Structures are given as structure tokens and as C-alpha cells.
Design a binder for this molecule. Structure first.
Ligand SMILES: C[S@@+](CC[C@H](N)C(=O)[O-])C[C@H]1O[C@@H](n2cnc3c(N)ncnc32)[C@H](O)[C@@H]1O
Length: 224
């Protein structure tokens, strides 16, 4: 599979000078000069991964892994943006739809190292851990290390005190955790990521014995 099949075509761009998730940045001629993210409130990053629409998904995946960046801008011969390809696109439009990955377990790809947090941890400390995690979410465990929940940035909005403060993360965590196992296929993991709109599934054994984490980013390694 090629980039052209999985990318989102004709991305909205922003031409400099100037005052979704991010917008490709171009000059007067329309050539790509960087990308700007909404979170990053020059603020434009120049060293962004780029590919052509006829390149393989493998090439785009390699670049994402190389720059530890979640998207690549697709340009034409003129170096002008004609599409955008994100990790999300690869998961939802490719891994979750292709028949090729129904026969590939995630055992060789999931992370054995995972940042977690005890459910009794005050929110601020839990947020510090989230900030220092390579995952968008922190699996939550009880006092004995058993998996009991999971939490991410969006869960902060579950705190009624935002209507305008350092309680246990247990108060905003998601209790029903969608999990994976080492033998689960890339196909099924992607199906779950797409279905629940989540970027990671804790990897377990037994009923709640945490042994790893499979992130959408980890699935890119399958393409290599
Ligand atoms: C639907 S995801 C979307 C996150 C996306 N980055 C966003 O900003 O919209 C956010 C929710 O999924 C939950 N979540 C994350 N991973 C999960 C998992 N493995 N199992 C169950 N729920 C999960 C989080 O706790 C949170 O309530």
C-alpha cells in the first residue's frame, strides 16, 4: 500500500506571513516550509517528514519512527502539499481494513516498557507522569499492581471543578479497559483502536496482569 491510498487529500494549509490538529505551512509559491500545531500555541517546525503520494507506506512509516512524529506531509514534484498522512490514518484506513494483517500477531512489536500510575495518585503527580510518557495514556493499577483503569488528557474534562484540586486519578479514570495480548493480531488491535478511537491498548496476560502496551505508533514497525 501506497501513501496515496491512505492519505487525506487536499489539506488546508496556511500561507506565511500569518498571525484540525495541525496545518501544513507554505510560502507564496505554495511550497511546503513546515507545519504548525494547534497545541503549540517562529512557532512553525521546519524539519517535518515528507513523502510523495506514490511512495510506499513502509517509507512513510520509517520516517514517522525516525522523527518520532505522528504525521507526514505528502508533496508533489513542486514540493507543494497534496495530502497529509497520520498514524491515525494508517490504523483506521489500512491496518483495520486490510486482510494482510489478520495474520500477524503483535508479540514482536508491543512495548515491554510502560508508564503506569496507581489509582490513588494525586492528579498533579499523575499528570507529571503522563507528560513523561511515550504514550497518550497511563494504564492505572491498584495497590497490588493489578490493572484497574486507564487515563488520558481528555479525562481531565471529567473533573467538575473545571467549570470556571488535587484529588486521586481514580476519580477521572476509565474503568473498563480495552486490552490486547501478545497473540492478538495487528488487525484486531487496529479494529479496536478504530472502534473505540483510542491510540493504545494495555497488553496483558490472565485477567489484568499488565505486561506491556501496544500503541498505534508501535504498529508502524510492522510495515518495516
Ligand atoms: C476516545 S479516546 C480519544 C483520545 C484522543 N486523543 C482525543 O483527544 O480525542 C479518550 C478516551 O479513551 C479512553 N481510553 C484510552 N485508552 C483506552 C483503553 N485501552 N481502554 C479503555 N479506554 C481507553 C480514555 O481514558 C478516554 O476516556
Amino acid at each position: 500500500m501506497r501513501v496515496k491510498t491512505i492519505m487525506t487529500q487536499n489539506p488546508v494549509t496556511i500561507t506565511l506571513p500569518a498571525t484540525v490538529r495541525s496545518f501544513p505551512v507554505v510560502n507564496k509559491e505554495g511550497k511546503l516550509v513546515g507545519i504548525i500545531s494547534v497545541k503549540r500555541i517562529m512557532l512553525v517546525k521546519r524539519d517535518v517528514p515528507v513523502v510523495k503520494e506514490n511512495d510506499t507506506l513502509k517509507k512513510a512509516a520509517k520516517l514517522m519512527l525516525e522523527y518520532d512524529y505522528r504525521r507526514v506531509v505528502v508533496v508533489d514534484s513542486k514540493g507543494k502539499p497534496v495530502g497529509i498522512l497520520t498514524v491515525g490514518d494508517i490504523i483506521r484506513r489500512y491496518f483495520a481494513k486490510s486482510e494482510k494483517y489478520k495474520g500477524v500477531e503483535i508479540e514482536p512489536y508491543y512495548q515491554r516498557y510502560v508508564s503506569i500510575v496507581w489509582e490513588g495518585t494525586p492528579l498533579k503527580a499523575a499528570l507529571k507522569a503522563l507528560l513523561l510518557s511515550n504514550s497518550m495514556a497511563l494504564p492505572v493499577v491498584d495497590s497490588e499492581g493489578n490493572l484497574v483503569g486507564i487515563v488520558d488528557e481528555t479525562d481531565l474534562l471529567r473533573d467538575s471543578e473545571i467549570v470556571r484540586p488535587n484529588k486521586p486519578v481514580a476519580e477521572i479514570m476509565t474503568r473498563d479497559v480495552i486490552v490486547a495480548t501478545p497473540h492478538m493480531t495487528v488487525h484486531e488491535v487496529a479494529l479496536k483502536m478504530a472502534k473505540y478511537s483510542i491510540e493504545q491498548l494495555p497488553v496483558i496476560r490472565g485477567e489484568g496482569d499488565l505486561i506491556g502496551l501496544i500503541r498505534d505508533f508501535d504498529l508502524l514497525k510492522v510495515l518495516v
